[PDB]
Design a protein around this nucleic acid. Structure first.
Ligand SMILES: O=c1ccn([C@@H]2O[C@H](COP(=O)(O)O[C@H]3[C@@H](O)CO[C@@H]3CO)[C@@H](OP(=O)(O)O)[C@H]2O)c(=O)[nH]1
Ligand SMILES: Nc1ncnc2c1ncn2[C@@H]1O[C@H](COP(=O)(O)OP(=O)(O)CP(=O)(O)O)[C@@H](O)[C@H]1O
Ligand SMILES: Nc1ncnc2c1ncn2[C@@H]1O[C@H](COP(=O)(O)OP(=O)(O)CP(=O)(O)O)[C@@H](O)[C@H]1O
Ligand SMILES: [Mg+2]
Ligand SMILES: [Mg+2]
Ligand SMILES: [Mg+2]
Ligand SMILES: [Mg+2]
Lengths: 673, 674
RNA sequence: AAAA
RNA sequence: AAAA
């Protein structure tokens, strides 16, 4: 702790405490974990020579580097202390030493505008024109290679730059590994406070105006993008500036000037003889209602895809063609023609997010809905059953959230035999909600048919998260999603014939009793009454008979009927005691099943046992045996029975669920599909 | 019709005269904006051309698509003569376009002094707030005034005239709650922001009105790094110096973060609270000793990763200071490096508070373009690594995708049925299929180091910096397919054979390297797709290679259960389908009864000594044998052991034989579900 | 806020 | 280019 006290004592420049701690035995060379900072590094950074000397006399290593490889000597240049630079040079520092990114003391003096340090270092033999040597990894990225002059230019240090050029023989035209020279660096200054003076100085010393920065940006183009008439004027006074250069977007200085509505700059470019054959110049000026610029351009000789979506697409084709100003990566138009729906904070609109067609949900940037929607979407990219989040753009207090463009909602789809659609839609939604809860850590709170979106596939996707809640642990929030999911099950099974709102209006038990079949009834009940194992609820329910095809249900009935213990009614057999009813279970459809079957097929099946008289009896096992046996020889009866899967399910609607419930947690699970 | 508009746009009076006198439509509206020849003439401020169009019957008040009238356009152009002309033609001085813009507002927007003065004297309502469409209003658009327009557009003379001569309300607010002062500080034209700000304050503008992120004028001025604006705002009596934006940041904290020493010191001198955040530590990080001392003298104060492999490093990265690059927080450094790369490396990162892998590129590069264009186009492909986003900084491009634990190659470096091989190859097949057919690209670099493994352990396709459009070249698809075939062999061999020499040997050599018939047949089909190239990977997902041993065993039992097989029917479809013939070479099951245990064999024949016939060496009988034995064992286990393994071991060519024979018949119903 |  |  005394070690951490030492560093704090130094940081607060408390000489007495530092003395006290050192004389008490504190580790004078202690390095803090992430950074490798020592008391000495801190003392130099505070520019406190007295504290520095105190530390050295207590045994501080004078050249011990921190994690980025910086020495106390180099830090002394950053602080601008000639006294400290002198001291460390007498303690073994080398004037041209560098950190692990290649920064020397001289460069740092230039970076920080430290004139006296800079002069002192020069006179102690600092190499003025060293280009930074950095790590191999950085070098592949074209990092490294910068010089003190570039540093002075980029940081806007006019006096340092003058001294470098006139007194220290700095190479004005050196380039970094990105190909940038001092002039480019100056025009990349975030501190526009001295850019003009800097630019004048560099140009007068023979700086090359025809050099490129990152995105193909020339000095002239950067000056135009700074909207700086003075910079542009000075650059155009160069005798051999290449006025028609284009950036990485193929844009000239003139085109950019017109696009940025810089009339005076544009006119100057034209008068200097910039080509007007470089884009839609006149149309752009016209679009910006600049009649004066339109005339200037003309008097200087200026001239004059397939959508994925079916439902949208006619509109998307129009949106793809029309002019629209970009908002970051998003091209769209808040207009009735491109509106998908009305919304509390605007609407849903067609858009292109990275040339990709998307739906755009608008928000007031600060709003509770905005942060709920965006927080969930940012955290749920790995969830495949959610609508996929492309990205978001903020503009002027507005937030535009971009998301997979879908054809229609589940509700609209339903407004347009085995119901396979219900099965795989609910399956996708179950998986969506599950991943949301367990992986994403959110609940939805607004599970309803309008928020289920249908692909052109037609695959379903969960959407609308502006009422979602981050999960802290309150089981009531999960329960709400589950009981909306239960109502969603019934909504889909009923094919939208019952609105979702009056399903919400009625109780759980009323929703359950509204179920048209035992599978949906049992599934919904389980959603409404999950165990203590709420976490595994949706996982388990994906294996519920509701999701079994009619062929699969029929197959498992036959599979269980094929158990030899069933085929030969073994008394105390495990499967038979498992399948037995009990007080007080039943008004079951199959309590006297042999009487429910056709007379002809039943007597024909019983014929197989007439020698010993082991006829079928009204036990659940014999019924399963009956189903297994009938299934086998059926490959006359086929007409009298019809679809065998459909037949047994129709006359015994509670059988499948009964078998599942009975064998759900035993080794006989193996018979399930 | 088009020639007339063009004639007007070129101010060619004579040509306009000729076209009009020649019977051109004078009220033609172009498709994009509903522009007429008259709208253009007014925009060009050509009263002579306007008068010409009117005398040929141009509707003087016909609006374009956004609702703007010629009268409103005249204000934009700044033409008093045209404004006067249209008022005499039925224009109302306070009329507006569909977004609420009046002629007066437009004069203010465009800084047209003479137009503005004329309109005011003709009764323009100076203090109207824009009424816009219902949809825009729900977004809190609308509500702006001419004064806000002048302020935002930097029109100083217009602003003074509005304030001093026209009774403009200095403190009106738009629907976002912004006043003129806020609008002034949103000018993209900092040439006049000081004068505008000074003038508004002198007329009693409210300094404490919020902008669009909890931003006060003070905070906005600090963010402009503008000392003059900051000085002037601090001179206002009821300035709220301690207000925080929606990030909870004060003007002082932002000043320190932005390394604005003079501004920060001024704020401190004006009495700003120094309990704002890590003020001092931020100043230290920026090596500003003088700022540290100023702060101190004014009394300043002195989560779980998902990844296992990465995790410790992610915890460190989460904790340390790092400057943000847009939505990305990362550190190009060995400690956080995943791999070396041609244009930098792969690194740990947080893209929107989410852990990701970051691939670095030189921003212009061919590799960068190929990687990013593929990723942007493939977001709906669930089997690819998921694209979070990209950041472009200073000629560098940083591409963020899901962070995976390890590669396929690393994973497999670390009797049994190879469950892993089927599951990884299934995912990769679906990945490639979607890339080709949905995303419309070819990968071109299918190899084990580009298959990434989840914590699940699910497989994902990555690395797209060599991907191609795709434009129609079958050869491009072919290359992916034969890389895929080699990937199959590579995985089945558990990585014991390097992928590079797999690539070095021919297709026939790779096929012949297969250790079992299922991989052999699957690889051959990848190397030799038919006319159905597009459905190749989709069809092959149903190949026996992807059937579990249980499922292979089951289909055999299913086929063996056919009645025609049990009752060796004279002319049955299934028996003739299963029948070999010329010149099918010697299968392992040709004399199968001799290959059985064969104490098991006599026990099996025991079922047919009273009724029926003993097993013969036909394929049908072997399938019946398999079906029967399955039934018996379910009711022998010690002799056979695992039955699926048993039949596959002694008859390795049986499963593929049955599949090939029955593939395009109704008997495919006996196959597994997927 | 808004044109081939 | 780079500290708790
Ligand atoms: O190793 C074995 C061999 C056979 N069996 C069963 O013994 C019965 C004989 O059938 P098979 O002789 O093979 O054939 C029948 C018809 O299938 C068509 O021709 C014949 C009739 O004329 C069938 O049982 P069950 O019919 O379900 O009672 C078979 O499963 C075993 O259990 N284990
Ligand atoms: N990605 C998309 N593709 C197609 N249609 C979409 C869509 N996203 C939303 N929609 C449509 O717009 C409707 C509304 O979108 P959304 O559900 O996200 O807003 P919302 O319900 O939260 C607004 P409010 O609460 O005020 O009613 C959806 O029900 C759907 O009809
Ligand atoms: N999302 C991710 N998660 C974990 N590791 C990843 C990863 N993305 C890439 N890697 C690792 O980094 C290695 C290289 O990444 P990547 O394949 O994308 O670059 P690359 O092969 O195109 C560069 P080069 O051509 O120079 O060899 C990968 O093989 C893998 O080991
Ligand atoms: Mg909704
Ligand atoms: Mg909602
Ligand atoms: Mg790779
Ligand atoms: Mg690559």
């Amino acid at each position: 702790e005394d070690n951490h006290l030492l560093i704090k004592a130094v940081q607060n420049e408390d000489v007495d405490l530092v003395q006290q701690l050192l004389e008490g035995g504190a580790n004078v060379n202690f390095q803090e974990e992430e950074g490798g900072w020592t008391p000495l590094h801190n003392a130099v950074q505070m520019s406190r020579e007295d504290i520095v000397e105190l530390l050295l006399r207590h045994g501080a290593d004078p050249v011990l580097r921190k994690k980025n490889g910086a020495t106390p000597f180099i830090l002394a240049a950053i602080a601008g202390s000639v006294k400290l630079l002198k001291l460390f040079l007498s303690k073994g520092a080398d004037v041209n030493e560098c950190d692990f990114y290649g920064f020397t003391a001289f460069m740092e003096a230039a970076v920080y505008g430290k004139v006296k340090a800079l002069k002192f270092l020069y006179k102690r033999g600092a190499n003025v024109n060293l280009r930074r040597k950095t790590k191999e990894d950085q070098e592949r990225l074209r990092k490294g290679g910068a010089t003190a002059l570039m540093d002075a230019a980029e940081k806007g240090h006019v006096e340092v730059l003058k001294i470098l050029l006139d007194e220290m023989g700095a190479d004005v035209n050196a380039c970094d590994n990105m190909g940038r020279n001092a002039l480019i660096h100056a025009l990349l200054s975030s501190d526009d406070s001295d850019v003009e003076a800097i630019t004048h100085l560099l140009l007068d010393h023979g700086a090359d105006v025809n050099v490129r920065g990152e995105r193909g940006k020339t000095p002239l183009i950067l000056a135009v993008e700074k909207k700086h008439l003075g910079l542009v004027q000075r650059l155009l006074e160069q005798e051999h500036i290449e006025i028609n250069d284009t950036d990485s977007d193929g844009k000239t200085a003139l085109l950019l000037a017109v696009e940025l509505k810089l009339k005076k700059i544009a006119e100057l470019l034209c008068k200097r003889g910039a080509s007007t054959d470089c884009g839609d110049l006149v149309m752009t000026a016209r679009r910006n209602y600049d009649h004066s610029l339109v005339k200037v351009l003309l008097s200087h000789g200026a001239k004059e895809w397939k959508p994925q979506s079916s439902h949208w697409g006619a509109a998307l084709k129009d949106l793809h063609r029309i002019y629209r100003p970009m908002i970051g990566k998003l091209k769209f138009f808040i207009d009735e023609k491109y509106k998908i729906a009305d919304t509390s904070e605007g609407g849903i609109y067609l858009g292109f997010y990275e040339k990709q067609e998307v739906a755009v949900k608008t928000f007031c940037e600060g709003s509770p809905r905005a942060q709920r929607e965006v927080s969930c979407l940012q955290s749920s990219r790995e969830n495949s059953h959610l609508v996929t989040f492309y990205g978001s753009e903020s503009h002027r207090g507005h937030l535009f959230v971009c998301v997979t463009l879908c054809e229609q909602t589940l509700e609209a789809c339903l407004d347009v035999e085995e119901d396979e659609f219900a099965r795989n839609v609910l399956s996708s939604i179950f998986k969506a909600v599950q991943e949301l809860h367990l992986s994403c850590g959110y609940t939805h709170q607004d599970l309803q048919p309008q928020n289920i979106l249908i692909d052109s596939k037609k695959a379903a996707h969960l959407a609308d998260f502006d009422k979602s809640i981050k999960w802290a642990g309150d089981p009531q929030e999960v329960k709400r999603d589950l009981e909306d999911l239960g109502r969603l099950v019934l909504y889909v099974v009923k094919k939208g014939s019952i609105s979702f709102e009056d399903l919400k209006a009625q109780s759980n038990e009323e929703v359950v009793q509204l179920s048209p079949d035992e599978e949906t009834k049992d599934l919904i009940h389980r959603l409404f009454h999950p165990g203590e194992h709420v976490r595994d609820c949706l996982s388990d329910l994906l294996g519920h008979p509701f999701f079994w095809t009619w062929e699969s249900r029929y197959r498992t009935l036959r599979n269980v009927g094929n158990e030899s213990d069933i085929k030969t009614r073994k008394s105390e057999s495990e499967i038979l005691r498992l399948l037995q009813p009990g007080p007080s279970e039943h008004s079951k459809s199959f309590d006297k099943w042999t009487t429910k079957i056709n007379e002809c097929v039943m007597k024909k099946m019983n014929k197989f046992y007439e020698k010993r008289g082991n006829f079928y009896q009204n036990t659940v096992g014999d019924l399963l045996k009956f189903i297994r046996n009938l299934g086998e020889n059926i490959d006359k009866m086929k007409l009298k029975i019809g679809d065998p899967s459909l037949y047994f399910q129709k006359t015994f609607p509670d059988l499948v669920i009964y078998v599942y419930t009975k064998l759900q947690n035993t080794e006989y699970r193996k018979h399930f599909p």
